[PDB]
């Protein structure tokens, strides 16, 4: 694609949506309000200098997400590969990386922004995923295939060591990802002729390889438009704003006006200086009527705000009351009950399995196919099993086991068996042996 | 005799009137005639106690003018001019065409009352005789 063509595409697309999130994350946009304004003769709204711009945000997201990820990932019962060689590797680890990668990959896409992920080759050459803020360029496909966009470029200004700003644009190819620095502006970063650097997203055999996957295409907001972030976030966004506003509100939005009908003092140039010096305000002649500040609205505002805050939480609608909780009610379901916050996530997590997170497994199988065997599906080895499960509560089994041992032989294996942690009764044996030995 | 000129002599008097600038300026038609009421000074001119008497005759060959002055109209003006000339002449006494001018025994009188308390008014009477009857 010509540089010009490449450059053009980006401009058309609106940078805003990715940027907004980023800006929002850093802070909410007070600016959007931004502030109270006054009407000129023109009547065009102008922001007053006086009003300050304040915003706060959470930052709720992080806490929940991390928990979500950990819970979701779980540990695979077993991992298998289509290829024997891959399978051997895959069995052993079995694959800490794989699970993490898949979870991360799915998680990232699900999570904000993303919105769009563009693979880049790692130095290792192992697939590495990074997220960059949207330029955002409008996606277009150089290639005939409309559906895919072979190439998308994003150009963002970067501060150098010097900190001088130069426009930088990156060229993306389906086959390879390119990074360009265009200091001159005359040319994109060299070459890049082709497969040679910038490197292809992934290379196989030490040679550039193409996934054959459709090149990254921006994600439209989902109809569900539900995100892990979203679930809290909807409540949170209100919650944060309200909390932040409340603290500010009391001091703020006087803010701060003093008006008296009468009576003017010496001409205000003198007046201001003297007035401060004299200090205190006195009224003479006509009133003397109560003035703007602090005034009633200090109290009123507090009252109003208090109502507002209560409502504001309700807008969050997380819930007025502290958890009963419904469960606890200690049971197996108790655990589900235990994390209300997590539970909502859990549905999503479960959803992910529905999502084709499992499909990713199929993808792995596809990967497996790619390498070879070629032509079989070793992916399932005579069975397919997935377990969340989680069948057993850790506590309950353990507690039972201790009592059980005297009465009869427990577990030892049984709790183990599900994994199975180990077939070997030996661990069990020792317990028994002690009993026999004793005492 | 003339006749034309007797009118003319009368004309001469007219000439005198024109000749006398201060008459026009001074006059001073007021007070004399109403305006007596008007504030002092008010100078009125008129005969003294004059009511027509005698009939089927000329009132008199001589003509007399009476002045009553409060505020003193141009008694002074007339008096200065007349006095100067009269003193100037002084004689001979006026005679007209061999006629005997002389008036009889003259008359003098003066009385003043001031309601206002304005200084006393004086009355001057002048009589002129022209030609013998």
């Amino acid at each position: 694609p010509d540089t010009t063509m490449i450059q053009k595409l980006i401009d058309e697309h609106n940078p805003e949506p990715l940027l907004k999130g980023v800006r929002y994350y850093m802070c909410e946009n007070d600016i959007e309000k931004k502030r109270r304004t006054y009407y000129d003769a023109a009547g065009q709204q102008l922001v007053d200098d006086t009003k300050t711009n304040n915003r706060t945000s959470h930052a709720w997201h992080k806490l929940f997400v991390d928990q979500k990820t950990q819970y979701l990932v779980g540990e695979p019962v077993t991992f298998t590969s289509d290829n024997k060689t891959l399978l051997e590797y895959v069995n052993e680890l079995a694959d800490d990386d794989f699970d993490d990668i898949l979870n991360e990959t799915v998680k990232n896409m699900s999570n904000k922004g993303i919105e769009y992920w563009h693979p880049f080759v790692d130095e290792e050459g192992e697939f590495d995923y990074v997220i960059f803020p949207a330029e955002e360029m409008i996606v277009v496909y150089k290639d005939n295939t409309r559906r895919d966009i072979l190439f998308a470029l994003r150009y963002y200004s970067y501060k150098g060591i010097m900190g001088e700003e130069t426009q930088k644009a990156e060229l993306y190819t389906d086959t390879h990802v390119y990074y360009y620095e265009k200091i001159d502006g005359v040319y994109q970063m060299d070459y890049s002729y082709g497969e040679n650097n910038p490197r292809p997203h992934m290379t196989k055999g030490g040679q550039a390889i193409g996934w054959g996957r459709v090149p990254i295409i921006p994600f439209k907001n989902n109809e569900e438009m539900v995100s892990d972030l979203k679930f809290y976030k909807d409540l949170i966004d209100n919650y944060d704003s309200i909390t932040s506003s409340t603290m500010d509100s009391f001091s703020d939005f006087q803010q701060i006006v003093y008006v008296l009908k009468n009576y003017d003092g010496e001409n205000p140039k003198e007046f201001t200086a003297n007035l401060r010096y004299h200090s205190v305000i006195k009224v003479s002649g006509d009133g003397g009527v109560d003035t703007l500040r602090a005034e009633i609205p200090v109290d009123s505002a507090a009252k109003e705000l208090e109502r507002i805050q209560d409502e504001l939480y309700k807008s969050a609608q997380a819930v007025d009351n502290s958890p009963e909780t419904i469960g606890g009610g200690a049971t197996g379901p108790a655990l589900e009950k235990l994390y209300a916050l997590l539970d909502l996530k859990a549905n999503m997590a479960e959803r992910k399995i529905r999502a084709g997170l499992r499909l990713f497994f199929w993808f792995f199988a596809e990967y497996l196919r790619n390498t070879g065997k070629g032509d079989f599906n070793p992916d399932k080895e005579l069975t397919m099993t997935f377990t969340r499960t989680r069948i057993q509560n850790d506590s309950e089994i353990v507690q039972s086991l201790v009592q059980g041992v005297t009465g009869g032989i427990m577990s030892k294996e049984t709790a183990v068996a599900r994994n199975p942690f180990v077939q070997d009764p030996e661990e069990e044996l020792a317990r028994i042996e002690e009993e026999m030995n004793q005492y | 005799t003339w006749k034309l000129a007797s009118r003319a002599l009368q004309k001469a008097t007219v000439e005198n009137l024109e000749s006398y600038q201060p008459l026009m300026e001074m006059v001073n038609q007021v007070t004399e005639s109403p305006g007596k009421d008007d504030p002092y000074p008010y100078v009125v001119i008129g005969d003294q106690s004059s009511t027509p008497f005698e009939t089927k005759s000329s009132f008199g060959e001589n003509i007399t003018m009476d002045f009553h002055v409060w505020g003193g109209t141009t008694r002074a003006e007339a008096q200065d001019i007349s006095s100067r000339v009269l003193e100037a002449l002084t004689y001979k006494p006026l005679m007209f065409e061999g006629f005997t001018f002389v008036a009889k025994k003259l008359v003098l009188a003066q009385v003043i009352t001031d309601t206002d308390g304005v200084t006393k008014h004086g009355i001057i009477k002048v009589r002129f005789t022209i030609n013998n009857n």
Partner: protein, 109 residues
């Protein structure tokens, strides 16, 4: 409320009298043209004596028009009158000439 005024008006002045002539001769000169406004007392119309008078002497209020009055005749409405009683601006937010008094006191010897 009149505003700029009067308009084109002509004034005649009467000065000097003629004497020594059977007839009287008068000379008159034009006066500067200005609005003249005057308000008739028309007496109080108590008119207790009610004997008199027509103001000579019609008491006049003329904005910034001293000149026309007295020692001049002002022709408004055509009519002609001589003025006495040097001006008095009793009223007239701008100085106005008035005529004061009527000639000849009524009281007569």
């Amino acid at each position: 409320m009149y505003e700029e005024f009067r308009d084109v008006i002509t004034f005649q002045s009467y000065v000097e009298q003629s004497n020594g002539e059977g007839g009287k001769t008068y000379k008159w000169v034009d006066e500067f043209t200005a609005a003249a406004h005057v308000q008739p007392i028309s007496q109080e119309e108590y008119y207790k004596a009610q004997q008199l008078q027509t103001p000579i002497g019609y008491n006049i209020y003329t904005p910034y028009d001293d000149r026309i009055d007295k020692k001049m005749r002002v022709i408004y409405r055509g009519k002609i009158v001589t003025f006495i009683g040097d001006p008095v601006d009793l009223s007239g937010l701008q100085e106005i000439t008035r005529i004061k008094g009527k000639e000849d006191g009524a009281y007569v010897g």
